[PDB]
Amino acid sequence: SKHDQLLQFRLSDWQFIRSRLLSTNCWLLPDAASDTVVIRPLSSRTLARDSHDYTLYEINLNFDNRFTPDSLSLQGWDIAAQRLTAAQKSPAGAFRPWKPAGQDYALAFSM
Amino acid sequence: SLLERGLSKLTLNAWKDREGKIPAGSMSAMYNPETIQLDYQTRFDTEDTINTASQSN
């Protein structure tokens, strides 16, 4: 969808990008050894203990659930309709970054 | 041997740079050492890999 009106108000110009990637459901994937960047939306090799090809030394994994909600029900004030647009709840369990082998966040804006 | 029976002492030459361009002094020492010894040593570290397929260092 085309924008009606963005505005970069004295931002760093890199600060503006990763505040605009957060609102677009994309991440950067920067590549060294080139000037090519593949921006791709948030959506295998099978390294195993038995496998000879890759030698492992340490596997740290944190598994936190403090800052992980389940909903993100966000909504905002529609100027034309004045209904405070219907709550678009997002289910948890879509886009699972950790898939194992074996609280509801909600804001409302005045805009 | 094969020509004559005179001794050959050891000579300690010195420089100043890494190469041979700038010679410092140079002495030959009488009364040869009776025994030299040159020790080699190579350091290895064992791989403590978690996969336990192989033992290596």
mmCIF file of C-alpha atoms in Angstrom, chain B residues 28-46:
data_model
loop_
_atom_site.group_PDB
_atom_site.id
_atom_site.type_symbol
_atom_site.label_atom_id
_atom_site.label_comp_id
_atom_site.label_asym_id
_atom_site.label_seq_id
_atom_site.Cartn_x
_atom_site.Cartn_y
_atom_site.Cartn_z
ATOM 1 C CA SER B 28 85.645 -17.309 18.551
ATOM 2 C CA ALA B 29 85.647 -19.164 21.856
ATOM 3 C CA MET B 30 88.383 -21.571 22.893
ATOM 4 C CA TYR B 31 87.708 -24.849 24.743
ATOM 5 C CA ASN B 32 84.775 -26.339 22.770
ATOM 6 C CA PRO B 33 81.566 -27.151 24.711
ATOM 7 C CA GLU B 34 81.917 -31.045 24.907
ATOM 8 C CA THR B 35 78.097 -31.249 24.396
ATOM 9 C CA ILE B 36 75.464 -29.176 22.639
ATOM 10 C CA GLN B 37 71.726 -29.588 23.080
ATOM 11 C CA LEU B 38 68.905 -28.199 20.977
ATOM 12 C CA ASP B 39 65.381 -28.809 22.272
ATOM 13 C CA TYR B 40 62.345 -28.633 20.015
ATOM 14 C CA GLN B 41 58.809 -28.336 21.364
ATOM 15 C CA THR B 42 55.383 -28.036 19.735
ATOM 16 C CA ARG B 43 52.273 -27.102 21.711
ATOM 17 C CA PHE B 44 48.985 -28.913 21.071
ATOM 18 C CA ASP B 45 45.551 -28.306 22.602
ATOM 19 C CA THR B 46 42.896 -31.017 22.814
#
